[PDB]
């Protein structure tokens, strides 16, 4: 029940209840996705239609987002309507109905749509293959439900009262008075929630290196490399991710994208090279690894990535507080590799 807010002299408030309930904590495959798609269905005291048609008249919307670590319950609204929305999110966390007709009419078709829209992008396929071959049973869980292991409704209820506990959530409010938000989160149903355990582990997530996976796919072909990063060398890889996509590097025309997903215990640096024909992807990924196996001086990109980190920490307010100044050089060591697409013409890990 860490409640934090940040005032502003503006018009739109934004509440968020973030729960450590992502794919990394999922018991079966896709239970976090199904609970996420379940989130704003009907409660025991208010229907899902009544919530939408009263929030429209009060001027605000609800959303809930899933990633590897979090289930985020966001409420964007007009500034002086705050107790309605804290009681709405408290009711969603405490008492949601969990009806099987809601599972079979809304939530399973919504999840089927989410899986079918993420299946067509070969970069999402390569990213989850990369996560799964780097981390095996923690962070390498599948992100979305695709029905390979059957998730019941009791599995969703069990995951819901496993992760919707008072020690496993944060409440964070943009443009909210912090004293009034703290007064409204108690005197609510976030005080009656079970004071469970916090699921985040301060260990290291037990990575694996040198792994490779190849997936058949019709369409664009992607070659992806992935490097697990500990807590110490996090900012060197952020400078590398911002250096490879900026105009400072000669490889920016060959790299489709490059990013570093950060966590509270390290992260994963992913790099994707994607187009429609395997000869260009093979040529480009061989050039990328042959240039990264020699050194790269990352010190030009420090102020650039200071700006980029300020930009991307304006949107989120998860501060990781990185150094950026002790970053001097990079040389590629060992890395996992995923080939998605025309894999009879994409190179293997031997040839990189």
């Amino acid at each position: 029940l860490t409640v934090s807010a940040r005032d502003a002299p503006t018009k739109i408030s934004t509440l968020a209840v973030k729960v450590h309930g992502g794919s990394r904590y999922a018991t079966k495959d896709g239970v976090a996705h199904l609970l996420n798609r379940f989130n704003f269905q009907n409660t025991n005291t208010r229907s899902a239609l009544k919530l939408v048609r009263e929030s429209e008249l009060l001027g605000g919307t609800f959303k809930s987002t899933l990633d590897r670590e979090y289930i985020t319950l966001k409420a964007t609204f007009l500034k002086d309507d705050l107790p309605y929305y804290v009681n709405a999110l408290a009711d969603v966390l405490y008492k949601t109905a969990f009806k099987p007709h809601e599972l079979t009419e809304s939530v399973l078709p919504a999840a089927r749509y989410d899986y079918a829209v993420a299946e067509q992008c070969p970069v999402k396929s390569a990213e989850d293959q990369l996560y799964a071959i780097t981390f095996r049973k923690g962070l390498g869980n599948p992100l979305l439900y695709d029905g390979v292991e059957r998730v019941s409704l009791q599995d969703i209820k069990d995951f819901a009262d496993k992760v919707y506990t008072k020690e496993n959530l944060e409440v964070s409010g943009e443009n909210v008075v912090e004293a009034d938000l703290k007064r409204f989160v108690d005197e609510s149903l976030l005080s009656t929630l079970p004071a469970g355990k916090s699921l985040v582990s301060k260990s290291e997530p037990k990575f694996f290196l040198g792994e490779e996976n190849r997936v058949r796919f019709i369409g664009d072909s992607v070659a992806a490399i992935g490097i697990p990063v500990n807590k110490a060398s996090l900012a060197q890889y952020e400078v590398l991710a911002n250096y490879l996509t900026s105009a400072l590097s000669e490889l920016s025309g060959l790299i489709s994208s490059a990013k570093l997903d950060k966590f509270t215990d390290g992260g994963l640096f992913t790099l994707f090279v994607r187009d429609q024909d395997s000869a260009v992807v093979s040529s480009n990924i061989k050039k990328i690894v042959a240039d990264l196996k020699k050194g790269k001086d990352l010190s030009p990109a420090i102020n650039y990535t200071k700006l980029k980190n300020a930009v991307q920490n304006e949107s989120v307010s998860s501060p990781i507080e990185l150094n950026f100044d002790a970053v001097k050089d990079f040389k590629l060591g060992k890395f996992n590799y995923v080939a998605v697409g025309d894999v009879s013409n994409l190179p293997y890990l031997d040839e990189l």
């Binding site: 002086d80 107790p83 309605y84």
Partner: protein, 76 residues
């Protein structure tokens, strides 16, 4: 202060029909009643009873409808 609820009402309705649509549709179907009454005034113009009761007291289209055939050149 801070709004915690939404004080509302329902009003009156009986399915698809409200009273708000009745208020919005009342004067135009008064006009529709007038339009079809003028259509009846068209479609009963050759009728003699509606002529001698209604259509021959128009101040300029009154004497236009009658004969004044003399009672001399008709057999009945």
């Amino acid at each position: 202060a801070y709004t915690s609820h939404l004080s509302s009402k329902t009003g009156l309705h009986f399915g698809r029909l409200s009273l708000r649509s009745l208020t919005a549709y009342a004067p135009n179907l008064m006009l529709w009643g007038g339009a079809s009454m003028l259509g009846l005034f068209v479609f009963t113009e050759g009728w003699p009873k509606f002529q001698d009761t209604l259509y021959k007291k128009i101040p300029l289209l009154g004497p236009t409808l009658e004969d004044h055939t003399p009672p001399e050149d008709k057999p009945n």
